[PDB]
Amino acid sequence: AQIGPVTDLHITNANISPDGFSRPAVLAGGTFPGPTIAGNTGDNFQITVFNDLTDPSMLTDTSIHWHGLFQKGTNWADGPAFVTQCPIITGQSFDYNFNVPGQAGTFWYHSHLSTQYCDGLRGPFVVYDPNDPNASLYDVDDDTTIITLADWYHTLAQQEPIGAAITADATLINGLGRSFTNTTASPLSVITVQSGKRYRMRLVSISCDPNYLFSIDGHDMTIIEVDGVNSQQLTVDQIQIFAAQRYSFVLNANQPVGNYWIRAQPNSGGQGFDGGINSAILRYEGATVEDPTTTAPTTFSNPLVETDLHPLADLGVPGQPFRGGADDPLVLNLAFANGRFSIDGVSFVPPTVPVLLQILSGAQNAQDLLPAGSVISLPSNSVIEVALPAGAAGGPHPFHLHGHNFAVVQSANNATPNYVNPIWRDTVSIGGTGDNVTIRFTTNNPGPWFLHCHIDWHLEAGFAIVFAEDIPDTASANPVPQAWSDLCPAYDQAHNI
Ligand SMILES: *[C@@H]1O[C@H](CO)[C@@H](O[C@@H]2O[C@H](CO)[C@@H](O)[C@H](O)[C@H]2NC(C)=O)[C@H](O)[C@H]1NC(C)=O
Ligand SMILES: *[C@@H]1O[C@H](CO)[C@@H](O[C@@H]2O[C@H](CO)[C@@H](O)[C@H](O)[C@H]2NC(C)=O)[C@H](O)[C@H]1NC(C)=O
Numbered sequence: 001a002q003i004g005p006v007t008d009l010h011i012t013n014a015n016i017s018p019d020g021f022s023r024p025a026v027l028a029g030g031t032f033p034g035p036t037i038a039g040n041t042g043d044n045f046q047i048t049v050f051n052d053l054t055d056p057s058m059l060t061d062t063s064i065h066w067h068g069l070f071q072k073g074t075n076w077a078d079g080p081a082f083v084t085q086c087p088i089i090t091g092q093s094f095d096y097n098f099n100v101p102g103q104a105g106t107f108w109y110h111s112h113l114s115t116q117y118c119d120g121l122r123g124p125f126v127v128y129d130p131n132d133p134n135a136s137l138y139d140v141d142d143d144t145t146i147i148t149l150a151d152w153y154h155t156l157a158q159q160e161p162i163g164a165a166i167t168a169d170a171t172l173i174n175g176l177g178r179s180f181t182n183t184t185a186s187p188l189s190v191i192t193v194q195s196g197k198r199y200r201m202r203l204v205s206i207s208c209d210p211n212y213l214f215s216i217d218g219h220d221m222t223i224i225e226v227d228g229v230n231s232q233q234l235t236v237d238q239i240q241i242f243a244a245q246r247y248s249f250v251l252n253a254n255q256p257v258g259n260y261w262i263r264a265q266p267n268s269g270g271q272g273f274d275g276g277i278n279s280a281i282l283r284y285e286g287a288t289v290e291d292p293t294t295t296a297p298t299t300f301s302n303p304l305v306e307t308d309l310h311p312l313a314d315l316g317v318p319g320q321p322f323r324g325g326a327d328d329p330l331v332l333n334l335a336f337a338n339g340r341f342s343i344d345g346v347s348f349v350p351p352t353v354p355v356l357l358q359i360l361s362g363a364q365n366a367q368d369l370l371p372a373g374s375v376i377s378l379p380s381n382s383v384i385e386v387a388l389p390a391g392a393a394g395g396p397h398p399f400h401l402h403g404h405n406f407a408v409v410q411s412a413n414n415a416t417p418n419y420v421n422p423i424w425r426d427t428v429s430i431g432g433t434g435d436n437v438t439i440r441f442t443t444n445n446p447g448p449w450f451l452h453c454h455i456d457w458h459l460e461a462g463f464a465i466v467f468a469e470d471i472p473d474t475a476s477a478n479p480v481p482q483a484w485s486d487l488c489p490a491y492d493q494a495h496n497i
């Protein structure tokens with residue numbers, strides 16, 4: 001079952017074996033992935049997070065972010081550790097109490113402390129629309145139509161050795177899949193459909209790192225939502241999905257009753273499908289309980305290309321139709337060297353006092369805010385442009401902005417900008433060497449909003465900045481509950497800070 005919008009959520013340690021290999025994990029709701037948190041557009045979510053963690057090898061503190069939800073007036077509830085709160089300590093709980101006005105779509109939640117989400121704290125978050133403009137395109141849309149794609153590691157996140165390459169050991173689809181090495185025939189996930197019906201498949205990348213080439217043998221996929229944003233219908237036969245992105249697609253169960261491979265090929269780790277790695281099963285009702293015998297094509301006919309997507313609504317693009325045509329046009333220098341990422345020459349290291357708390361205590365320009373050089377102010381009620389030119393090692397980097405979605409004025413692998421009708425989304429691949437992926441948004445949400453690469457290993461290695469949006473109105477716009485005020489004193493006492 002789905003939980004919420006008002007629910008408890010316990011964070012525990014447990015052993016799991018999603019690929020047949022046992023290891024300890026950090027779990028929400030006792031499962032990997034965690035349970036789906038759900039409600040309707042405009043609902044009040046009250047998610048009381050109980051930190052019950054005891055194993056220090058995966059950190060006993062936690063903080064949870066609700067990825068893609070704007071948190072307008074509730075910046076304190078956003079979750080990034082040392083940006084909007086101090087972590088919750090073990091044996092304590094915290095009520096994330098917020099509203100989702102004006103949003104409906106497919107989201108997710110994840111730890112936002114260190115690389116802890118990699119250790120298991122990740123799950124879907126769905127905001128249904130009772131008046132969804134896409135409702136008539138499908139018949140079924142429920143917990144059974146959510147598809148999560150996850151990377152899974154045998155080595156614990158905190159135990160990844162300095163100086164060695166990090167790659168995953170299995171791809172998990174709906175929490176199950178097979179290991180790339182020492183493969184065993186552990187159970188695969190099954191997604192069941194009924195011949196003749198149409199399904200809103202909610203595809204969620206909960207990856208810590210790889211992008212996936214997602215496909216379903218014999219089928220094609222009609223995209224109707226991108227990172228929470230309704231799109232015009234776009235039919236594809238493969239979707240390259242980067243870490244933290246979401247799509248809804250219509251799956252028409254229009255093939256013969258049978259079994260079809262679901263494929264998710266990561267860009268690193270195991271290549272191909274030998275032994276059933278990188279795989280799940282689409283099973284029609286009435287099919288034999290056996291593995292598919294289908295193949296992929298050598299070449300896909302209609303892969304997703306981001307510039308092909310367009311909003312369903314007339315969203316346009318803010319600003320003027322040329323580079324720099326914004327109130328606050330930025331170009332970030334995104335770099336990597338010697339194990340650390342930087343933005344404009346500064347590698348992100350979380351501060352002792354959360355950015356939001358520094359603001360509430362009276363720091364009132366970004367030069368006053370710590371970490372020095374990692375916080376950039378944005379003016380209120382302004383069009384912002386951020387160019388994100390690629391080139392830094394470890395690409396393609398999926399960049400994500402908290403508190404906002406954005407128009408993707410320029411996409412990967414295409415030098416032409418689009419000031420008319422590009423998709424809006426919240427996580428975008430910045431592409432490859434020489435690209436100039438560029439985003440736009442308007443500043444109508446006071447508070448400190450994290451901008452970072454969503455490859456969690458890169459975030460940990462510094463690939464982030466904080467946009468302190470409308471510093472002057474942050475305090476008035478974001479009244480804080482006592483429990484939030486209590487977080488840092490409890491954390492600092494527990495940690496002898
Ligand atoms: C990406 O686009 C930005 C503008 O959005 C370019 O920024 C300009 O950079 C030149 C020097 O490279 C400066 O003289 C300008 O002041 C910048 N802003 C402009 C023209 O609007 C940036 O060069 C582009 N990067 C790449 C790698 O193509
Ligand atoms: C590269 O990106 C541009 C801009 O998004 C794409 O150009 C648009 O193409 C569509 C489809 O033919 C036209 O309706 C628009 O008028 C174009 N807009 C602009 C500003 O040129 C282009 O198709 C993309 N290239 C590829 C190969 O997909």
Ligand SMILES: [Cl-]
Pocket residue numbers: 066067068069401402403404426
């Ligand atoms: Cl977000």
Ligand SMILES: [Cu+2]
Pocket residue numbers: 065066067068069400401402403
């Ligand atoms: Cu986010």
Ligand SMILES: [Cu+2]
Pocket residue numbers: 065067244400454
């Ligand atoms: Cu995120």
Ligand SMILES: [Cu+2]
Pocket residue numbers: 394395396397398453454455458459463
């Ligand atoms: Cu990255």
Ligand SMILES: [Cu+2]
Pocket residue numbers: 065080112400402450452
């Ligand atoms: Cu984030």
